[PDB]
């Protein structure tokens, strides 16, 4: 193990952090714009096309 004993630690030493928990990779904002465009194009499909 490390050194001879357990490493010293602060009496609180919380440090929550954990902003991201796995996942990451694909961004959410780009696909959010994608989903907005999806509902927009569905609304367009509701509007008449051709004829």
């Amino acid at each position: 193990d490390e050194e001879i004993v357990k490493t010293p630690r602060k009496l609180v030493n919380y440090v929550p952090l954990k902003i991201f928990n796995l996942g990451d990779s694909f961004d959410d904002t780009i696909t959010t714009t994608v989903a907005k465009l999806q509902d927009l194009k569905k609304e367009i499909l509701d509007s008449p096309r051709s004829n």
């Binding site: 009496l11 609180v12 919380y14 440090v15 929550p16 902003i19």
Partner: protein
């Protein structure tokens, strides 16, 4: 004997005052720890 006993009791009073001083110092350290925990909780809540 009463004079000796009351002098001993007065020294006991002063050592109680010293003990209360150390207890207040421990309480101040605990309050500093509480403030650090509070700012950490505030940062975590901000992320939340």
């Amino acid at each position: 004997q009463l004079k000796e006993d009351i002098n001993s009791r007065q020294s006991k009073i002063q050592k109680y005052k010293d003990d209360t001083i150390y207890y207040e110092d421990k309480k101040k350290v605990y309050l500093e720890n509480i403030k650090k925990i509070e700012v950490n909780v505030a940062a975590l809540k901000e992320g939340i």
